[PDB]
Every structure is written in C-alpha cells, then in structure tokens.
Amino acid sequence: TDQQAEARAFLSEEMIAEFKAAFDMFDADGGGDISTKELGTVMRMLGQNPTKEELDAIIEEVDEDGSGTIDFEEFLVMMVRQMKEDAKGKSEEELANCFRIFDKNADGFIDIEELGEILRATGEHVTEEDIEDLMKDSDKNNDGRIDFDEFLKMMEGVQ
C-alpha cells in the first residue's frame, strides 16, 4: 500500500482519470481486478501473445496482496514504474545521440576542440575561457576528453 501511495502521489487526477478508464477495459466482468485471463485478452488486443508463465510474472509484479489479480491501485503502481522507465529510456537515448553528434570524429570522446566547435556552433556568444571552463568541470577523470559516462553526468539535469 505504501507504493500505491507515492504512486498515486506521482500521478495527477488527469492521469488517474485515464488510467482508470484504461483499467476498466482491462477488467471484463467489472469486478475490481484484472485476472490472469482478463489480462491475456487485452495483451493480445495490444498485440502480444504472452504465456501463462509470462502473464503471472507480469501480474505478481504489483500484486502486494498475493491475490493473483491486479486492482486499480496495484495497477497505478505498475503504470508508474512504467512511466518512469519510459522517460528514462527516452532520456538516455537522446543524450546518447547527442554524444554521437558532438563526437563526430568517432573517437568515442569529445575533446576540447569539438566541445568548442559545438559550443561556438550554438547561437550563444562564448569565449575560449568558457569552453575550457566547461571542459574542466565536465572532465572528472582529468584526461582531457569527455567520455559517455561523463557526458551523461554533465548533461544530468540540463533539460
């Protein structure tokens, strides 16, 4: 129930509103929870073809009451974890891409040169000091370059 807490804390009425409408369609009989079968039907409508094992695992992932079914609460939890994972994937993908664009020389790094270029390539006004400064702040392993790890870190937050 503690999870169902922050979970509902996370979402908005809007969210809940829709996640409910969605939950209702999952739930055939309209009883109050998705069964190992009610789920199977929706999955296929969603274009999958899970197996008994697969289904349960997907069920008991948010079944805190060992019911073997999912209620609109356990469900919101599930939606949340997903919402999370989705946003994380999209982020790292974008950054990953940005790194390849900034790299271009494909050495797997971003040297003060490229950093300058890309920076100077922005509209913004910048002098070398700015560039070397950003390098010094980003390059934690003090090797001159900026590795993907560091790039993830440095861009951590920025939009």
Partner 1 sequence: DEDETTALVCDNGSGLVKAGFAGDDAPRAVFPSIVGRPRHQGVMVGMGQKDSYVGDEAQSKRGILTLKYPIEHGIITNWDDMEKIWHHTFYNELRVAPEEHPTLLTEAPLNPKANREKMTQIMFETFNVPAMYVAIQAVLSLYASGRTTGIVLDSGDGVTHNVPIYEGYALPHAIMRLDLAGRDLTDYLMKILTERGYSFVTTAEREIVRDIKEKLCYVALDFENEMATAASSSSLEKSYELPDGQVITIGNERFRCPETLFQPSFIGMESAGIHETTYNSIMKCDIDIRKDLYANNVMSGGTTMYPGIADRMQKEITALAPSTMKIKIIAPPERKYSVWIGGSILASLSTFQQMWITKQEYDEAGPSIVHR
Partner 2 sequence: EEKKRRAATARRQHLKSAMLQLAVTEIEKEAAAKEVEKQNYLAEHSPPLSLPGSMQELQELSKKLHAKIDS
Partner 3 sequence: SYSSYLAKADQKRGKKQTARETKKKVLAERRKPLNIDHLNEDKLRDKAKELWDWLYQLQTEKYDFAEQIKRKKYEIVTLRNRIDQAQKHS
Which residues make Cβ contacts (< 8 Å) with residue 140, sequence separation at least 6? Answer: 150, 153
Residue 29 annotated as lining a ligand binding site: yes
Interface with partner 2, residue 127, by CB under 8 A: no
**Torsion sign (Cα): 79, 23, 61, 65:** positive
Q: Of 4-12, 54-62, 71-79, 122-130, which part binds Ca ion (CB under 5 A)? A: 71-79
Tell me which amino acid residue 128 is.
E
Whichever of 11 and 95 has its CB closer to partner 2, that residue is 95
CB 50 within 8 A of CB 43: yes
CB 147 within 8 A of CB 141: yes
Whichever of 68 and 108 has its CB closer to partner 3, that residue is 108
Residue 14 annotated as lining a ligand binding site: no
Residue 143 annotated as lining a ligand binding site: yes
**Which residues here bind partner 2, judged by CB under 8 A?**
94, 97-98, 101-102, 118-119, 121-124, 126, 130, 133-134, 137, 154-155, 157-159
